Ligand binder design. Structure first.
Ligand SMILES: CCCCCCCCO[C@@H]1O[C@H](CO)[C@@H](O)[C@H](O)[C@H]1O
Ligand SMILES: CCCCCCCCO[C@@H]1O[C@H](CO)[C@@H](O)[C@H](O)[C@H]1O
Ligand SMILES: CCCCCCCCO[C@@H]1O[C@H](CO)[C@@H](O)[C@H](O)[C@H]1O
Ligand SMILES: CCCCCCCCO[C@@H]1O[C@H](CO)[C@@H](O)[C@H](O)[C@H]1O
Ligand SMILES: CCCCCCCCO[C@@H]1O[C@H](CO)[C@@H](O)[C@H](O)[C@H]1O
Ligand SMILES: CCCCCCCCO[C@@H]1O[C@H](CO)[C@@H](O)[C@H](O)[C@H]1O
Ligand SMILES: CCCCCCCCO[C@@H]1O[C@H](CO)[C@@H](O)[C@H](O)[C@H]1O
Ligand SMILES: CCCCCCCCO[C@@H]1O[C@H](CO)[C@@H](O)[C@H](O)[C@H]1O
Ligand SMILES: CCCCCCCCCCCC[N+](C)(C)[O-]
Ligand SMILES: OC[C@H]1O[C@@H](O)[C@H](O)[C@@H](O)[C@@H]1O
Length: 277
């Protein structure tokens, strides 16, 4: 048909309390492009994660992450939309003072059906399920070869200005390859959002309530990545000029109730820009 394209840049931040120092902030630059015809979406992304910049470069384990995906929109229509994504991703780890470690490259393969089913003129049952295989350098990297993920639930529309999404979120890492044991975990949350849609402004308060969560790792005392889920309240802002230029702001406070002397607390901040054409 016609072709559509986007390009954008997002910069995110993730902190931990207190003052302190617990050590001491992540930074997540990233850029994307997508296109754009028909039931076909082509996407590529570049992401990178590491400690808060200050680079001599005396950094700390960081990692970069090319991404490519293609999405096929089988059926779209007000009754029952259905869709699919295959994805490939590469984690390019660079360890900095982790004895026994220099560098890793683990791949992730992704198969994610998605859906939007009408229930009434005010209720929808939308969602995505996502199946992954992770490939090389697992021992080094700690991932677990297989992982399921899904966020699905109900949307109710008060009117063109206010909506309510309440979802079940589930994330299981497990190993298909007995015997490997590394990165096994399970997360369950309820997620609730109230997308406010005020002309060009867009605000969404939201929250994640953990149902049950267990891991194999970050407690006493392992380093941090995927995944990695916390109770949070957050708010997302978004503005569309109709240029084709949008920007966004998001902030979220996350906690973990504990039995130590008190409890671990996190901050997320996140600005984006997107341009359509
Ligand atoms: C893909 C590129 C998106 C924009 C990159 C983020 C721009 C800011 O880069 C920033 O340098 C500054 C040091 O004062 C700080 O504000 C940030 O912590 C640092 O990462
Ligand atoms: C990644 C997007 C590819 C777009 C190709 C379909 C046509 C849209 O843009 C196209 O660029 C092509 C060369 O790049 C030419 O064949 C077309 O004449 C030009 O219109
Ligand atoms: C720009 C739109 C033209 C369609 C691009 C080629 C695909 C047309 O063919 C489609 O592909 C599907 C596989 O994804 C199959 O279910 C069927 O062969 C068909 O519906
Ligand atoms: C045969 C080894 C790879 C050859 C290059 C292209 C074929 C890759 O095909 C497969 O993609 C799968 C995605 O689900 C992965 O699980 C596998 O690691 C891979 O072998
Ligand atoms: C995301 C918002 C959650 C509320 C929507 C689902 C509430 C579950 O309630 C259900 O709703 C159906 C629609 O009338 C009723 O017909 C069912 O009998 C009832 O069990
Ligand atoms: C509208 C939002 C729906 C919330 C549903 C909460 C209960 C979900 O059902 C869940 O199915 C899981 C499959 O992994 C089981 O393992 C869990 O025991 C069960 O709680
Ligand atoms: C994972 C790194 C942070 C990116 C967060 C994107 C915006 C806020 O996270 C939420 O995720 C949902 C996924 O189903 C989106 O549908 C919501 O609109 C969005 O508010
Ligand atoms: C995606 C590309 C981003 C380029 C952004 C360049 C603009 C720099 O952003 C700066 O914001 C500050 C607010 O604290 C103001 O004080 C400055 O006037 C402004 O230049
Ligand atoms: C189960 C229904 C729950 C309603 C959904 C509202 C979730 C948003 C959380 C609000 C936090 C934002 N606030 C109010 C502090 O500004
Ligand atoms: O569509 C929302 C997307 O969010 C991402 O964070 C998930 O990893 C994808 O599987 C999902 O499709």
């Amino acid at each position: 048909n016609d072709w559509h394209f986007n390009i954008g840049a997002m910069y995110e931040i993730e902190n931990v309390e207190g003052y302190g120092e617990d050590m001491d902030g992540l930074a997540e630059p990233s850029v994307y492009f997508n296109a754009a015809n028909g039931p076909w979406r082509i996407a590529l992304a570049y992401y990178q994660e590491g400690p808060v910049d200050y680079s001599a470069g005396k950094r700390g384990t960081w990692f970069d992450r090319p991404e490519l995906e293609v999405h096929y929109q089988f059926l779209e229509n007000d009754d029952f939309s259905f869709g699919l994504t295959g994805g490939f991703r590469n984690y390019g780890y660079h360890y900095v003072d982790e004895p026994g470690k220099d560098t890793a490259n683990m791949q992730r393969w992704k198969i994610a059906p998605d859906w939007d089913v009408k229930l009434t003129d005010d209720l929808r049952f939308n969602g995505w399920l996502s199946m992954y295989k992770f490939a090389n350098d697992l021992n080094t990297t700690g991932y677990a070869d297989t992982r399921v993920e899904t966020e699905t639930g109900l949307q109710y529309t008060f009117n063109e200005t206010v909506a309510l999404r309440v979802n079940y979120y589930l994330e299981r890492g497990f190993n298909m390859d007995d015997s490997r044991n590394n990165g096994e975990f399970s997360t369950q949350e309820i997620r609730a959002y109230l997308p406010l849609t005020l002309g060009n402004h867009s605000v969404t308060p939201y929250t994640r309530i953990g149902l049950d969560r267990w891991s194999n790792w970050d407690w006493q005392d392992d380093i941090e990545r995927e995944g990695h889920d916390f109770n949070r309240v957050g708010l997302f802002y978004g503005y569309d000029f109709q240029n084709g230029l949008s920007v966004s702001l998001e902030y979220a406070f996350e906690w973990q109730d504990h039995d130590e002397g008190d409890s671990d607390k996190f901050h997320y901040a996140g600005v984006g820009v997107n341009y359509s054409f």
